[PDB]
Amino acid sequence: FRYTRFEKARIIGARALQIAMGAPVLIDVPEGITPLQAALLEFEKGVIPITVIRPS
Amino acid sequence: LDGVIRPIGRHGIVGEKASVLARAAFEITTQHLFAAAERGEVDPLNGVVENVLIGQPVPVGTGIVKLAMSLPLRP
Amino acid sequence: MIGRKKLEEHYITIAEAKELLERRHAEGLAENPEEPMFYEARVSLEHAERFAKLKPEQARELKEKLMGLFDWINERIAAKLVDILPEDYLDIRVIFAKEEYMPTPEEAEEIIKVIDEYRP
Amino acid sequence: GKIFTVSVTVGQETTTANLIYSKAKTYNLPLYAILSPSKVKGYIFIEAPNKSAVEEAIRGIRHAKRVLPGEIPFSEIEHFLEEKPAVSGFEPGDIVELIAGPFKGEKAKVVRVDESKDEIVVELVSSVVPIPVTVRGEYVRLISKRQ
Amino acid sequence: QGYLGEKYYRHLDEDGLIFPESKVEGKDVLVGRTSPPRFQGRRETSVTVRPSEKGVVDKVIVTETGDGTKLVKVTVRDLRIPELG
Amino acid sequence: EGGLRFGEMERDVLIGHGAAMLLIERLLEESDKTEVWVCESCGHLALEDKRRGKVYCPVCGEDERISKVEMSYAFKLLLDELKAMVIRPSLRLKDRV
Amino acid sequence: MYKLLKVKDVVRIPPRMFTMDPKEAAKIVLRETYEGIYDRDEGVVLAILDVEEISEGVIVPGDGATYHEAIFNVLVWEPRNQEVVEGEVVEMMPYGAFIRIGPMDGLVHISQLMDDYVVFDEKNRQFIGKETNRVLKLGDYVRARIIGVSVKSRVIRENKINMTMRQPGLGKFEWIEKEKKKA
Amino acid sequence: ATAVYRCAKCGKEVELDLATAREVRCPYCGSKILYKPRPRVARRVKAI
Amino acid sequence: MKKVIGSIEFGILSPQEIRKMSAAEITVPDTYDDDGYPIEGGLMDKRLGVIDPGLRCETCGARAGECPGHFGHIELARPVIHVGFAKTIHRVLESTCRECGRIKLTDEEIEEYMQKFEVMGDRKGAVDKLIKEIHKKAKERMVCPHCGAPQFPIKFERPTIYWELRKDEEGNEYKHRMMPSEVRDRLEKIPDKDLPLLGLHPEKSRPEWMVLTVLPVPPVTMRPSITLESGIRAEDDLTHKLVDIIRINNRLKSNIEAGAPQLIIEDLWDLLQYHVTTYINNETSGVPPAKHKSGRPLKTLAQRLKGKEGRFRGNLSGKRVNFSARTVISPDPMISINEVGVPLAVAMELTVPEKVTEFNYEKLKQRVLNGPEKYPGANYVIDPEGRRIRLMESNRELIAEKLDIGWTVERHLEDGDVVLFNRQPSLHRMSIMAHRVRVMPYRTFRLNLP
DNA sequence: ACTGTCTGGACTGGTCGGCGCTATGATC
DNA sequence: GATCATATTGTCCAGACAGT
Ligand SMILES: [Zn+2]
Ligand SMILES: [Zn+2]
Ligand SMILES: [Zn+2]
Ligand SMILES: [Zn+2]
């Protein structure tokens, strides 16, 4: 299983929107980054909770 | 697509588009809209340009991605 | 319209509603602000505890007895009967005057001494 | 004598008719008759042997636009030259609109109508309290016939 | 109403005209003009510098138009030292 | 102090990039975002009275089934133009989920 | 009339409630959303008891909140036409008397309170019968059936309830007992 | 609110009140165009 | 909750719907009086909306800038053929009998065409082909299959003139002008079951609605009025067209109520028809376009919708956006391909709205404490409830002390921020890319050479 | 069934800057 | 003098249509 570019962008956008209005970060933060960077590090650490629904 | 050669203009692919707003936005806006009013056509807004005109997300790229979330997040 | 669709609809009685409102009051007491509910829910709980004629389990038993006794009545009729708790023909008549059926004196009497069982 | 229509500027049909009369008097025109009813706005009628005389008589006046090609039958304008009060045909209980007067641009309902005093009595529909007022019969226009 | 700000009229004289050789910035008032109200207090219709433009007021000319009304033309100069772009 | 035009070509290349939410933010959320009241019974634009404090559909009634829809003000102007051109657009509302 | 309903609905949980249990968060959202309002086909939404089943969340575009398909129990109150109910008079003013029967307050007309020209006493807010000589005071249990419900607004207070009381067999509990004694 | 102005052609000082001016012109030569004189308040200009 | 437009259904507005949607009735062909106030019953009536800031709308009670506008209706003295449907009307006039009103097809043919319509599906081309075939088949029948009444050919003259080729008792062939009232009466006789054969919806596209009896005047907001620099209000072209329409309609009503002869009534009817046709579309072929007093032709709703400058292209498909800058580009090999040179003046103007969280609270607090005149700073602060406050010198420290989790800070453009970089014309999707902000104190943009 | 003719529509996008216009012949 | 109703009704390509 692999993540497409559109799916990854949607996941990062949803995670950043969640972080902006709540949703505390599941990993450490560099104390000053934007929520988009927080979502990027969450994706890089493989800790994101958001899945992708695919038709079948 | 329909078994005959069609152009890309108002008399071709755009002409047989199922969306009223897609046909009206490109060419012959007045007569296309009036003919749609005559026929009582229903626009399902399944295209891209109609969602652009309205404000709904387009059905291409990230607009087709569906996401699921597990609520009990415990960091 | 509450929600997208309704699955089950039941005509609940006064006693069970009072129990549910007491549970909501306990939940609000567990909630940090001192106000459990709004004005309408608190006033409803006060009215229910003022008109708490029967215990919730006694009300449930009476309602199920009414439901199993006859067939033309519904949950609303049984709930209204257990709410009023009739004793004679007058209140039964003023309840069923505008209803679809004006019950005969025999079935009215049988409803009456079904009702007055374990009646406070 | 055939009746033709001359279109003129609204509100000054009488002035154009007087100008045409003066032109006919001082220019020897074969004009037979000129009519300008007050109810008809922006047009006048000319009884002339032919339309050519009509367009020649109205020529040179900037307030006369054109002459309609058709010919008006005399039965159409027969009712115009008839002695009849403006209050005739108005029955109480209907709704009228007041053209002029202090109540300009107001809808009302007719209560009393008389032809001897050339006046009519109307109650304002927008008034919360019913207060009848009197207004000239020619100052109202029927909008819906009802009893 | 319509008062842009206290500091925007700091370069104006008592006649509502800007003094020459005065440094100006964006939205700075050059000619103080008041208009009669539509259909209240007098409106504000002062001529101001463009928001993205600045410079120094080079000259002020007072004259009349063809109808005899007053006309004030303010020429403002800005030094353009060459730079990137 | 005018804005910068995001023309048809810019929208086309944003579609080609596959950026749906970026296009939504550019064309809608930053230019003419607005909210309207729509009647679910007939699709007409409902009227909201601040004095009465209530939202209702004048062509239809329906004081209950009225929903708030977020859309561009240009789309509302287009709907008004269509109504002025004796064309009735009926907005069939759908749930977001 | 009190009612218990099982309602399936989409509940929106904001990201600030992610750390909490999904059932508790859905219950909190439903309580802050639906409680205290009036529904045309349901009545006075009184309380949300619990949430039985919840589903996996779905994130819609343009919103970080999570939407869950949840089934829950709602306790509501629906006034019915020609329905009898017992209450207590809580407010009296000359044109009519207000009685509490539940979440709403029913209005009983002074003309139609009894088949007698009952006078309102402004000294102590009392109702005095001219011929029957029956005194109506605050805190008296009464029974009446409803004839008019106004559902023109979604606010409970703005809704109006009018009942009927001139029919025999209604009124105060003492009045009903006295009528039963004659029969 | 009267003020002094400089004529465009003759250059002599012209005195008039713009608030209540029925007509603004230089009476000395009839010129209808006037220049606002530069104020004597010291201004500071950065050298390049 | 929130709802989205799942689908749009199109149709023809019925006169009853126009009357119900109208908040006012317009009869005065004027906009403002001498003092500038709106005239009651006019086009600028407060019941249709408010543009001037002082006024308050009568229908909804809202001030200017928030009132959506409300439509009005004008009761025409005589029906007027809609030009956009006019040719289509002629098609119906060539398909339905003049007496019975049914289509000129047999019952078996009608049933077969119904099966053909049901079978093919939803492709537009097949529907248009079937409609054209049905119209061609019905237009060549001079005898009604249901009533047997004779039929006459109908000649369509552009834009809204209909001629019926009739025969006198002597066999001479002449042309009778079909008035819009007669056309509407003929269209009213067509039942709902024959409408799908003509390509009309029984409940949405009734043919009688194709002839205008009530004219929907647009809201004030959609045709706004502005005040020029000379103090004279500048009316819109649509406002002038509606003024002319109202004046002609009032003259026609006055002449009808006065018992004017037929020459008057048809002439005023033709004038009103021309005015309504120009109001629907001023570029209609065969008629002179409506012109202003200065000789400038007006653009009506059709020109507002169509064209490069129209609503569809100039306002809907493409529109001006906020938070955008534009300036000259200069080379900068010292930056990466991922980076764009953003000037300090541009960076301090364009603001990124960043929500205050537990990890960026100190940075956003420092941005607020810097202010709009110090880089890196902030320009606006939005509370969780939703009130936006502009940061000045006075409240710069007060807002910073009031900053908490959930607040939004519109901070200046910082290094590493993602922005779009587009050059026009955008021939391909590679004509815009997302770069990283690099802030330099010069004035021009800087883009890497590759 | 072919053939020339009449009618209708579109004519790349964006930006900087300016110029200039949007009443009048009767009436008291 | 200060107001006021009215103020006219360039080429090329493609689809539909009388004519032979
Ligand atoms: Zn509706
Ligand atoms: Zn001089
Ligand atoms: Zn309004
Ligand atoms: Zn027939």
Side-chain angles (χ1 to χ4, degrees), chain A, chain B, chain C residues 1-66 68-120, chain D, chain E, chain F, chain G residues 1-151 153-183, chain H residues 1-47, chain I residues 2-450:
Chain A
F1 175 71
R2 77 177 146 221
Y3 273 135
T4 82
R5 39 186 288 233
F6 311 114
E7 287 166 356
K8 179 194 188 201
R10 191 75 253 280
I11 284 183
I12 293 309
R15 192 61 201 139
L17 201 40
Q18 286 168 1
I19 289 173
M21 48 214 205
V25 202
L26 330 179
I27 44 146
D28 290 299
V29 278
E31 185 65 41
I33 58 150
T34 86
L36 159 70
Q37 320 201 258
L40 282 175
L41 311 161
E42 257 183 50
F43 205 86
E44 277 157 29
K45 239 78 64 193
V47 83
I48 219 78
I50 307 182
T51 43
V52 172
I53 284 144
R54 267 164 198 206
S56 33
Chain B
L1 196 55
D2 283 340
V4 285
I5 305 184
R6 329 171 290 172
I8 50 154
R10 58 188 170 274
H11 303 124
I13 301 167
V14 202
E16 336 292 328
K17 251 164 183 229
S19 164
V20 172
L21 301 182
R23 302 189 252 103
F26 168 58
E27 227 99 288
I28 46 180
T29 296
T30 281
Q31 39 261 90
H32 254 146
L33 281 168
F34 277 139
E38 290 148 29
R39 212 89 83 256
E41 294 183 37
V42 179
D43 190 14
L45 312 162
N46 293 333
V48 178
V49 57
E50 40 244 55
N51 291 300
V52 157
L53 298 202
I54 296 199
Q56 264 99 62
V58 301
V60 79
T62 70
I64 85 156
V65 182
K66 263 123 86 185
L67 298 186
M69 183 79 191
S70 288
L71 228 273
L73 266 205
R74 302 215 202 278
Chain C
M1 166 88 275
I2 293 286
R4 302 298 180 83
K5 90 150 92 64
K6 199 159 56 156
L7 296 189
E8 304 183 350
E9 162 197 89
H10 303 286
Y11 287 87
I12 199 43
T13 85
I14 290 264
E16 288 108 284
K18 168 219 179 90
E19 159 179 331
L20 292 177
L21 285 160
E22 275 172 339
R23 291 217 286 107
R24 274 281 295 119
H25 189 81
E27 287 161 345
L29 282 184
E31 171 83 52
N32 203 4
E34 77 273 352
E35 199 45 62
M37 323 96 90
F38 40 87
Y39 176 74
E40 267 93 30
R42 150 160 56 84
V43 139
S44 266
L45 169 63
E46 285 181 355
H47 167 268
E49 81 194 358
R50 190 103 30 88
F51 283 91
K53 275 200 219 58
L54 293 188
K55 288 312 144 53
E57 84 287 338
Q58 294 312 119
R60 258 186 247 103
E61 286 160 23
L62 201 155
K63 157 190 251 28
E64 80 99 359
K65 271 203 302 230
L66 261 52
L69 167 71
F70 267 12
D71 69 317
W72 64 280
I73 87 172
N74 42 56
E75 306 208 63
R76 182 177 43 88
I77 289 328
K80 194 56 64 171
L81 285 205
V82 74
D83 283 7
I84 301 299
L85 283 186
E87 57 265 336
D88 70 274
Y89 220 161
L90 178 64
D91 41 16
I92 281 285
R93 180 171 325 274
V94 315
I95 280 159
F96 281 99
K98 205 71 37 53
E99 271 278 347
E100 195 262 325
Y101 186 19
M102 192 36 264
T104 63
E106 36 260 62
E107 63 200 84
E109 280 329 287
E110 82 191 65
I111 276 169
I112 278 156
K113 86 293 294 174
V114 159
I115 279 287
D116 51 44
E117 192 202 14
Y118 52 85
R119 164 210 292 224
Chain D
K2 288 135 73 179
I3 321 286
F4 304 93
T5 325
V6 179
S7 156
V8 296
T9 317
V10 201
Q12 37 169 237
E13 322 100 2
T14 55
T15 87
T16 305
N18 286 338
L19 253 73
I20 292 176
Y21 172 64
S22 102
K23 174 150 175 180
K25 201 148 60 58
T26 64
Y27 255 56
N28 189 3
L29 288 161
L31 224 35
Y32 296 176
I34 291 143
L35 165 67
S36 154
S38 76
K39 293 277 282 321
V40 173
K41 321 224 71 59
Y43 302 68
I44 56 177
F45 312 103
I46 286 188
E47 167 137 57
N50 37 54
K51 209 232 286 201
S52 47
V54 187
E55 42 208 302
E56 207 278 273
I58 72 137
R59 172 209 325 310
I61 323 287
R62 96 168 311 123
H63 281 318
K65 310 186 188 139
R66 65 159 171 307
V67 175
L68 276 41
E71 179 249 1
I72 296 194
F74 196 57
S75 154
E76 302 239 38
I77 66 138
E78 251 171 32
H79 82 307
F80 279 133
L81 318 113
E82 275 173 11
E83 180 75 271
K84 159 176 56 60
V87 234
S88 84
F90 282 108
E91 275 73 30
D94 53 2
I95 305 114
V96 291
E97 161 67 62
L98 286 45
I99 274 43
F103 327 91
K104 223 207 76 63
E106 293 244 45
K107 279 158 97 278
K109 149 184 166 88
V110 175
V111 174
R112 297 189 293 277
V113 38
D114 64 318
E115 315 96 359
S116 37
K117 294 186 253 290
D118 52 276
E119 62 170 8
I120 201 170
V121 175
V122 280
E123 271 177 33
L124 273 311
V125 290
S126 45
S127 93
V128 49
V129 68
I131 165 67
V133 300
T134 171
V135 62
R136 333 289 308 310
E138 67 264 58
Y139 280 35
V140 308
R141 150 181 92 57
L142 184 31
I143 73 104
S144 102
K145 241 291 203 173
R146 207 64 261 279
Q147 208 271 331
Chain E
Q1 84 311 9
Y3 206 67
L4 314 176
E6 151 89 1
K7 73 144 158 46
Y8 284 125
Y9 308 95
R10 76 190 177 276
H11 296 303
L12 293 200
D13 207 13
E14 43 152 14
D15 44 20
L17 306 187
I18 193 150
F19 261 133
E21 309 293 306
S22 316
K23 274 166 213 39
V24 302
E25 281 106 34
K27 330 189 92 202
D28 257 15
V29 182
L30 306 146
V31 181
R33 209 180 31 192
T34 48
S35 201
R38 64 308 162 283
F39 67 86
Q40 224 183 354
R42 293 189 63 83
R43 288 209 324 275
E44 211 260 10
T45 39
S46 307
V47 169
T48 55
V49 201
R50 314 285 191 85
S52 32
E53 302 213 355
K54 44 171 281 308
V56 190
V57 170
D58 186 53
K59 85 185 163 260
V60 172
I61 307 185
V62 199
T63 175
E64 296 154 322
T65 40
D67 326 302
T69 58
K70 274 113 196 63
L71 174 82
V72 173
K73 278 175 156 147
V74 180
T75 292
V76 177
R77 55 154 156 86
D78 186 26
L79 169 65
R80 292 287 160 80
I81 281 159
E83 44 165 346
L84 258 67
Chain F
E1 325 152 74
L4 268 312
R5 163 132 178 123
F6 213 70
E8 292 200 74
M9 299 182 96
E10 282 80 74
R11 168 215 73 181
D12 298 328
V13 316
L14 249 65
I15 289 153
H17 265 315
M21 326 300 329
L22 188 37
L23 186 51
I24 286 298
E25 180 258 342
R26 271 297 107 181
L27 279 197
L28 162 84
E29 253 145 32
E30 280 323 296
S31 197
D32 40 13
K33 208 220 208 162
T34 202
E35 316 227 44
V36 294
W37 293 99
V38 187
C39 170
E40 320 225 33
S41 282
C42 43
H44 265 85
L45 280 194
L47 154 77
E48 153 182 76
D49 202 330
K50 323 300 216 42
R51 320 157 34 239
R52 312 321 173 51
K54 57 168 320 205
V55 180
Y56 70 108
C57 156
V59 198
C60 158
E62 208 38 71
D63 36 358
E64 177 52 57
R65 272 151 48 83
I66 309 286
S67 308
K68 210 157 186 254
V69 176
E70 232 155 41
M71 71 202 204
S72 40
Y73 195 84
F75 188 63
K76 202 196 100 42
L77 208 59
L78 154 75
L79 292 193
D80 278 1
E81 268 134 2
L82 286 182
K83 278 194 270 280
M85 262 176 19
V86 202
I87 294 179
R88 175 204 30 240
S90 298
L91 306 180
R92 296 309 154 177
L93 306 187
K94 204 179 50 76
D95 281 305
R96 215 186 171 176
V97 198
Chain G
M1 167 96 270
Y2 285 90
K3 245 192 192 160
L4 177 52
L5 323 160
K6 202 166 290 210
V7 169
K8 143 177 303 207
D9 193 17
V10 176
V11 189
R12 172 197 177 276
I13 305 180
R16 47 174 265 253
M17 299 189 210
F18 278 179
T19 43
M20 323 174 22
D21 218 42
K23 256 169 190 110
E24 298 173 348
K27 186 178 176 164
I28 282 181
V29 171
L30 290 157
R31 276 211 275 233
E32 82 69 11
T33 296
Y34 272 126
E35 276 186 359
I37 79 193
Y38 200 105
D39 281 54
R40 331 277 291 236
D41 26 12
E42 319 299 320
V44 180
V45 201
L46 270 170
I48 319 278
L49 301 323
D50 60 324
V51 175
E52 295 181 348
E53 310 208 340
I54 212 174
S55 88
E56 289 300 314
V58 166
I59 299 161
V60 307
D63 200 2
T66 308
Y67 292 84
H68 285 251
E69 239 276 4
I71 312 145
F72 45 94
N73 294 98
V74 199
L75 165 76
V76 304
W77 188 81
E78 186 199 36
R80 304 266 336 245
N81 218 17
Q82 314 306 311
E83 173 215 353
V84 196
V85 59
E86 305 167 339
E88 158 183 342
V89 203
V90 291
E91 212 293 325
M92 302 219 222
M93 293 196 348
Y95 67 106
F98 282 88
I99 71 173
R100 157 168 315 142
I101 70 171
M104 299 225 50
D105 271 64
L107 190 270
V108 169
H109 209 336
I110 176 78
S111 78
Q112 178 269 21
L113 202 180
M114 203 165 170
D115 31 10
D116 185 278
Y117 275 65
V118 30
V119 198
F120 173 53
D121 162 58
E122 285 88 12
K123 249 301 292 170
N124 332 97
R125 264 161 141 84
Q126 291 311 39
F127 277 150
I128 305 299
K130 281 207 301 185
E131 317 170 5
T132 88
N133 218 324
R134 296 173 161 184
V135 41
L136 177 52
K137 48 160 218 191
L138 278 198
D140 277 359
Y141 295 156
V142 283
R143 155 175 334 152
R145 64 144 43 86
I146 316 175
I147 42 175
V149 177
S150 321
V151 198
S153 103
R154 310 185 32 89
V155 197
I156 321 172
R157 300 275 308 173
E158 311 209 315
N159 286 133
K160 318 295 265 213
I161 287 188
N162 275 81
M163 309 159 143
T164 170
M165 174 105 102
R166 258 192 136 114
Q167 331 187 81
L170 306 180
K172 219 210 293 319
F173 277 8
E174 323 297 320
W175 297 352
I176 297 187
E177 285 299 279
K178 271 151 33 194
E179 271 133 15
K180 171 210 56 54
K181 176 249 311 167
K182 212 266 298 183
Chain H
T2 185
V4 201
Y5 293 90
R6 284 293 277 280
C7 191
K9 338 262 163 83
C10 79
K12 295 199 234 63
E13 266 104 324
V14 181
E15 212 301 339
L16 39 74
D17 165 49
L18 270 190
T20 60
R22 81 305 299 141
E23 142 168 352
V24 46
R25 82 178 250 273
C26 171
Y28 306 358
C29 59
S31 149
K32 305 254 315 173
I33 299 155
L34 299 187
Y35 276 111
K36 192 158 179 43
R38 278 140 158 79
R40 200 57 56 270
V41 47
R43 63 244 198 215
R44 180 97 47 121
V45 178
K46 214 162 320 287
Chain I
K2 205 47 140 199
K3 288 198 128 95
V4 293
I5 302 153
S7 34
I8 300 184
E9 306 207 343
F10 289 92
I12 309 163
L13 261 181
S14 67
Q16 309 98 37
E17 269 175 303
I18 298 160
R19 285 179 197 119
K20 287 217 73 197
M21 90 177 37
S22 155
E25 154 95 329
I26 320 295
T27 44
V28 186
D30 217 336
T31 69
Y32 300 110
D33 41 36
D34 273 34
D35 46 297
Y37 212 70
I39 294 156
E40 288 212 37
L43 285 156
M44 270 319 143
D45 210 320
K46 280 136 63 88
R47 266 170 300 164
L48 312 180
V50 280
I51 289 330
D52 317 274
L55 311 187
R56 200 209 335 161
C57 160
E58 273 166 59
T59 309
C60 77
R63 321 241 162 199
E66 73 181 324
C67 167
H70 327 275
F71 277 83
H73 86 275
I74 296 159
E75 287 280 342
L76 304 167
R78 291 271 189 271
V80 169
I81 301 278
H82 198 124
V83 50
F85 312 119
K87 167 157 150 17
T88 301
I89 288 163
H90 172 234
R91 190 235 293 156
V92 193
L93 288 190
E94 294 198 294
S95 304
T96 65
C97 155
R98 47 196 318 275
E99 269 151 78
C100 183
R102 297 272 315 274
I103 211 189
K104 288 188 269 165
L105 290 176
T106 60
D107 306 31
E108 37 262 27
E109 275 164 309
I110 283 170
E111 288 226 24
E112 167 215 317
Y113 277 132
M114 296 276 72
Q115 330 264 12
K116 286 191 101 290
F117 269 125
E118 288 145 1
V119 152
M120 68 59 43
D122 47 3
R123 276 201 181 82
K124 219 208 60 185
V127 181
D128 309 9
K129 197 158 307 333
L130 200 43
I131 284 306
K132 224 157 304 194
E133 158 175 341
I134 287 176
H135 156 62
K136 176 172 149 316
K137 188 165 293 309
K139 91 168 275 186
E140 312 274 20
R141 311 220 165 140
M142 275 330 152
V143 170
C144 180
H146 312 96
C147 61
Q151 309 296 317
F152 308 103
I154 297 185
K155 252 58 191 82
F156 170 60
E157 193 191 309
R158 264 141 30 224
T160 43
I161 306 120
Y162 299 100
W163 298 102
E164 190 164 48
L165 279 276
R166 288 186 186 172
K167 302 162 153 326
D168 273 313
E169 295 190 348
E170 300 165 347
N172 291 319
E173 173 97 306
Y174 70 102
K175 276 194 306 167
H176 171 70
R177 166 93 181 274
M178 254 162 159
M179 281 337 261
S181 58
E182 180 178 0
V183 173
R184 215 198 188 269
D185 289 344
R186 282 203 29 172
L187 290 173
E188 275 205 84
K189 279 182 179 100
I190 309 155
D192 292 8
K193 100 202 94 170
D194 277 24
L195 287 202
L197 276 324
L198 320 167
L200 299 146
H201 205 282
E203 297 109 35
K204 292 196 303 255
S205 285
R206 291 270 340 158
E208 57 250 31
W209 305 339
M210 284 198 297
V211 192
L212 305 189
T213 43
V214 188
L215 192 74
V217 14
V220 173
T221 69
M222 164 199 157
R223 28 162 198 89
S225 96
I226 63 148
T227 322
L228 286 183
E229 60 266 328
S230 99
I232 303 179
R233 196 103 47 175
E235 284 331 331
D236 207 27
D237 298 4
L238 284 176
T239 322
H240 295 120
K241 209 55 226 183
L242 287 153
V243 154
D244 293 339
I245 282 186
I246 286 154
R247 177 158 36 84
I248 295 309
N249 203 43
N250 286 351
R251 206 181 303 162
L252 179 53
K253 266 186 249 222
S254 304
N255 277 270
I256 283 170
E257 284 323 289
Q262 224 61 39
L263 227 40
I264 302 270
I265 302 308
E266 316 257 319
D267 189 79
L268 281 169
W269 203 346
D270 283 343
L271 200 42
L272 181 65
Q273 166 73 72
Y274 156 78
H275 276 287
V276 172
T277 298
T278 30
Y279 166 72
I280 296 160
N281 182 23
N282 205 19
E283 292 204 69
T284 322
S285 143
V287 317
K291 277 184 220 342
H292 216 161
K293 221 159 52 206
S294 92
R296 173 202 59 134
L298 318 165
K299 54 190 37 43
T300 42
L301 322 156
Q303 292 87 51
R304 269 170 158 232
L305 276 195
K306 88 206 204 63
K308 213 190 307 221
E309 304 331 272
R311 192 87 44 234
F312 266 99
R313 292 175 66 173
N315 290 121
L316 278 154
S317 294
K319 66 203 92 170
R320 319 190 67 79
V321 300
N322 286 304
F323 289 96
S324 42
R326 154 154 183 132
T327 184
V328 200
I329 40 158
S330 77
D332 206 300
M334 280 341 269
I335 66 176
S336 168
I337 59 160
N338 273 175
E339 301 197 292
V340 59
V342 178
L344 184 65
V346 169
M348 299 222 333
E349 163 76 0
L350 309 181
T351 43
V352 167
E354 187 162 354
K355 275 252 185 42
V356 178
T357 61
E358 67 263 20
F359 46 87
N360 60 347
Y361 165 70
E362 304 286 335
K363 169 192 79 140
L364 291 180
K365 185 176 183 165
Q366 192 44 247
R367 291 327 172 257
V368 173
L369 260 177
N370 273 342
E373 320 282 342
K374 183 153 159 24
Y375 187 81
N379 288 2
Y380 292 89
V381 164
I382 304 111
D383 44 17
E385 61 97 335
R387 172 201 47 280
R388 161 136 72 245
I389 319 108
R390 172 209 263 300
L391 292 182
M392 35 219 66
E393 187 93 22
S394 59
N395 75 330
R396 156 165 61 84
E397 319 93 349
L398 289 296
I399 295 297
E401 291 306 309
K402 277 154 51 63
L403 218 68
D404 214 2
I405 313 293
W407 292 61
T408 312
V409 169
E410 297 191 4
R411 53 157 184 85
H412 292 158
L413 273 178
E414 272 176 26
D415 269 31
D417 265 325
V418 47
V419 289
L420 304 184
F421 211 36
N422 156 248
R423 190 213 147 226
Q424 283 148 334
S426 324
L427 318 165
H428 53 191
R429 89 174 182 185
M430 302 96 75
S431 211
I432 177 180
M433 277 165 291
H435 296 241
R436 285 152 51 210
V437 167
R438 191 86 94 85
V439 171
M440 332 174 180
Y442 276 156
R443 189 116 56 187
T444 195
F445 272 161
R446 258 134 300 180
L447 158 85
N448 198 4
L449 303 138

